[PDB]
Design a protein around this nucleic acid. Structure first.
Lengths: 58, 25, 93, 202, 119, 211, 92
RNA sequence: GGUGAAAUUCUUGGAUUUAUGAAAGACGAACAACUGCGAAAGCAUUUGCCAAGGAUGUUUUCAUUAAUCAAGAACGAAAGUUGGGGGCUCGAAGACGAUCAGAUACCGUCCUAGUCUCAACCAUAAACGAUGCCGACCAGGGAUCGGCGGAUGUUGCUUAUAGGACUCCGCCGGCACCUUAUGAGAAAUCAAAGUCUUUGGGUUCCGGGGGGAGUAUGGUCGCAAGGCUGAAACUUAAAGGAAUUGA
């Protein structure tokens, strides 16, 4: 499953190892057409309000 | 009172080494 | 050794309480030396809250939280939870 | 059986009155105490009455394996059955036996309140061969046990051999015919560990 | 009218999870789980894998058979819990009420982690 | 199996809320081990939240067992009152007393019930203490009273009357008022109830509680 | 006392024979055979072992059922108590 | 099942799971606390009975009965055990899987004795407050446990009240904390480890370098395990403590 909407805002890092700088996935919601919860992958820390393109997303 | 593992080891060996002369081997 | 007014550790006219076993390892611990921590926490999440209530009957419900005291063997608490070490004065807290 | 039966004397006349003789002894019974035998009898030790009127969880001695056979379950000393279940069940009273088996038996069947007397009899040791002899003499048993190894090969399958030994496997089949069927007959296991009482489930 | 009550049960250990599509009496209509696919072990317990399991359940219950109201009930806590619960919305499943009732600790206190489980 | 399974819509009795309970599928009513006659006495739990509408009973599930079926519409009478775990887990917070009690009672015809009752000391104006404890033998005096009071209010005309008190939990609250003169009591609920020593079905009588 | 350390009964009977474990059980149950017991009926410390499982009080003449070696038994106490409790609650 | 990762092991002999009864045996979560009681070991469901013990109160009574102890006596966790009940759970040894050159273990899985109870043994624990018992004194403060006293306080509503829970202040006796410590101490710390160099309050026990050795030997005891009592040859200059500074 998963649609494909423009952008995506990270709701909050669901955990991982971490401490400072967060290598592993994060749970994201689509910025527009909200309330679709999936796990998309990032390297590095990330904040809510951040804008990143999730082009094909899935 | 009772001390430490020195007495623990030697307790086991106390009657064993008396009986290891009847046995020998 | 003795740096403590607390004697050995939580022993005040008792010596031995009545044992709980750790959630983590199941080692016996008397209750006052156990380490209990309130984990009153939602089932959902932050994000999850929204989704459930949209697709559910009744306005929000209440959401029926999970309540658990978590029992540690001392060692277990050090690795993640609340021990961490301290500075000398604040240890009397 | 080397254990007592209380002599209870019923004496009342008529002519066809039938009376007299030995009901099985229970603990705590005394001479000159009255014994009541029947349906609506009071609940006191030594009285015999149908099992239905006895409440659940109640220790009894003697039960009937169909009415009028007089005493079948628990009769050997210091043993007793405990009536495990009833409910309002017309058909069935369930009794946990001293074997540990849970038995369906009619609710009409009589049982006597209490445990049977003379308990502890077998527990403490004889400490003579001669004490053993006297008990077995009075009952139907021939006293000394000669081992199968000690017997000749003609007399016994385990006999014979230069040295002392049982020649073959002791365990023989249950289906095996008379003469063949020797040793530990149809043993579920052997060698010394971790069994239990008869354990039915319901 | 839609009387609409039908429980789904998720049987969880920390190590792995499986979903059993039960009902109000509790007899199962169907069950399914991952491990026919590639990830095995604590990668089932994993939240990404948990979503895959959840949807497989739901799809039978609604559209095909056609019960609509449903309780989610779970047994003790995994990492998977948030993912399963969130995805019930995207299953197009309507929660009649949600109650989790994993089984409480009551002093089933024995060394082999008999107590160690529970909640 | 799915293209053979029945549908039972399960009906509550009369004295109760909303008559609808749920939807099941079983497996076709095939001769010898029919799906109807077979089961029944399984358990149906629906929260009082989904029956009274309100969330002032957001917990409290009720165990109903089926005794009779009339053509794929399965009747039920009270065979218990249950509780969530989450309700006991909330309520029971640290630093305060428990007051515990158990009851066994039968009703007119001998349907067996087990009533419970738990209670905390209630906070008083001007408290400094983070604790506020009663004094144990004092607690015990309360406990003895609870059993008597519940029994007197109860054992009247079967399930029927008592059940309709249980749902808005009237019985519990009446206790608190009288008792408070000597010692508080907080909450006080029926909590759980199982039948485990039923009389007889008495199928005639059951249909009075059905319509 | 005389040439007696502990006591015997049956230790003296044996000679060298039988053994230390074996005498423990039987010493306890043979002292019980000898043992005077108080009657429920008269209250005197009369009662003596008539036979196996049979006890008789000499003075009042009352004959009583009991254990083989001993007047009563631990098992006997348990059995009577449960029966009396069940009788008491049901009769109510 | 299981875990970090796997496997032994269990799976149409449709497990796992699910519900309902019943049986069996165990245990009293959360509540349950720098809080209680009991000589101590130790002791948490309800209720009844039975005797018991401390604290407190007392213009009741006796009038020095007291204090503390070799000997001697009672009780004394666990394990092991003697015999029954009893064996649910778990679980030395063993037997299995990984890990491991070895792994006999941690870890996983099977599981016997045993765990439980009862009558018996036993006599030991970091059986600890590592701190003898008893008495008087030297220093401020707030909690909480128990009882008592004083309030035309609160709640209670008990007919009204008294009580009781709450708030209080005073107070006997507590478990202890807190902060300073006059003072002790080697320091860490400590209202006792103070009141021993200001050297001697009463009583008792023990140590008197480290190892050997808590063994050897003898006596004593124990059912057994083994305990209790307890050396010396010979070795050797430090063993040990607390704090401090490095790594």
């Amino acid at each position: 499953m998963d649609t494909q909407v423009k952008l995506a805002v990270v709701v909050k890092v669901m955990g991982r190892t971490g401490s400072r700088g967060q290598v592993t996935q994060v749970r994201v919601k689509f910025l527009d057409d909200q309330n679709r919860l999936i796990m998309r992958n990032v390297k590095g820390p990330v904040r809510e309000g951040d804008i990143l393109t999730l082009l094909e997303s899935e | 009172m009772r001390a430490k593992w020195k007495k623990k080891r030697m307790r086991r060996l106390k009657r064993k080494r008396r009986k290891m002369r009847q046995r020998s081997k | 050794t003795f740096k403590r007014r607390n004697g050995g550790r939580n022993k005040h006219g008792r010596g031995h309480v009545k044992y709980i076993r750790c959630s983590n390892c199941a080692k016996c611990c008397p209750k006052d030396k156990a380490i209990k921590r309130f984990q009153v926490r939602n089932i959902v999440e932050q994000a999850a809250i929204r989704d459930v209530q949209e697709a559910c009957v009744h306005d929000g419900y209440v959401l029926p939280k999970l309540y658990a005291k978590v029992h540690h063997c001392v060692s277990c608490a050090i690795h993640a939870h609340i021990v961490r070490v301290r500075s000398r004065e604040n240890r009397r807290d | 059986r080397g254990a007592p039966l209380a002599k209870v004397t019923f004496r009342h006349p008529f002519r066809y009155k039938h009376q007299k003789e030995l009901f099985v002894a229970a603990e705590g019974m005394y001479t000159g105490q009255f014994v009541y035998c029947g349906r609506r009898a009071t609940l006191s030790i030594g009285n015999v009455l149908p099992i239905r009127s006895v409440p659940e969880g109640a220790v009894v001695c003697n039960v009937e394996h169909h009415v009028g056979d007089r005493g079948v379950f628990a009769r050997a000393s210091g043993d007793y059955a405990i009536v495990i279940s009833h409910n309002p069940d017309n058909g069935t009273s369930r009794i946990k036996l001293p074997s540990g088996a849970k038995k369906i038996v009619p609710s009409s069947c009589r049982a006597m309140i209490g445990q049977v007397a003379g308990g502890g009899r077998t527990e403490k040791p004889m400490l003579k061969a001669g004490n053993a002899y006297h008990k077995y003499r009075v009952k139907r048993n021939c006293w000394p046990k000669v081992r199968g190894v000690a017997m000749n090969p003609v007399e016994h399958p385990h006999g014979g051999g230069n040295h002392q030994h049982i020649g073959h496997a002791s365990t023989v089949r249950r289906d095996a015919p008379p003469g063949q069927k020797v040793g530990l007959i149809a043993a579920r296991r052997t060698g010394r560990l971790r069994g239990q009482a008869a354990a039915t489930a319901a | 009218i839609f009387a609409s009550f039908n429980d789904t049960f998720i049987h969880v250990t920390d190590l792995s999870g499986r979903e059993t599509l039960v009902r109000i009496t509790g007899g199962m209509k169907v069950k399914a789980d991952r491990d026919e696919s590639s990830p095995y072990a604590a990668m089932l317990a994993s939240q990404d894998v948990a979503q895959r399991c959840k949807e497989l359940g739901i799809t039978a219950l609604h559209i095909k058979l056609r019960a609509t109201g449903g309780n989610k009930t779970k047994t003790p806590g995994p990492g998977a819990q948030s993912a399963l619960r969130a995805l019930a919305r995207s299953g197009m499943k309507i929660g009649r009420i949600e109650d989790v009732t994993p089984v409480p600790t009551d002093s089933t206190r024995r060394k082999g982690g008999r107590r160690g489980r529970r909640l | 199996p799915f293209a053979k399974k029945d549908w039972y819509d399960i009906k509550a009795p009369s004295v109760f809320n909303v008559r609808n309970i749920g939807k099941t599928l079983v497996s076709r009513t095939q001769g010898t081990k029919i799906a109807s006659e077979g089961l029944k006495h399984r358990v149906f739990e629906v929260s009082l939240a989904d029956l009274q509408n309100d969330e002032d009973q957001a917990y409290r599930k009720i165990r109903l067992r089926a005794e009779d079926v009339q053509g794929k519409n399965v009747l039920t009478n009270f065979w218990g009152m249950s509780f969530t775990t989450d309700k006991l887990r909330s309520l029971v917070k640290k630093w305060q007393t428990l007051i515990e009690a158990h009851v066994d009672v039968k009703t007119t015809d001998g349907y067996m019930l087990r009533l419970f009752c738990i209670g905390f000391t209630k906070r008083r104006p001007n408290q400094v203490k983070r604790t506020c404890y009663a004094q144990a033998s004092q607690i015990r005096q309360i406990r003895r009273k609870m059993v008597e009071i519940m029994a007197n209010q109860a054992s009247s005309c079967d399930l029927k009357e008592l059940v309709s008190k249980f749902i808005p939990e009237v019985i519990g609250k009446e206790i608190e008022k009288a008792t408070s003169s000597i010692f508080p009591l907080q909450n006080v609920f029926v909590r759980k109830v199982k039948i485990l020593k039923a009389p007889k079905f008495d199928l005639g009588k059951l249909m009075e509680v059905h319509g | 006392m005389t040439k007696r350390t502990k006591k015997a009964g049956i230790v003296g009977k044996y000679g060298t024979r039988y053994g230390a474990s074996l005498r423990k059980q039987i010493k306890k149950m043979e002292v019980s055979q000898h043992s005077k017991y108080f009657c429920e009926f008269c209250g005197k410390f009369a009662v003596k072992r008539k036979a196996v499982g049979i006890w008789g009080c000499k003075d009042c003449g009352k004959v009583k059922a009991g254990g083989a070696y001993t007047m009563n038994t631990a098992s006997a106490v348990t059995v009577r108590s449960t029966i009396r409790r069940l009788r008491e609650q049901t009769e109510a």
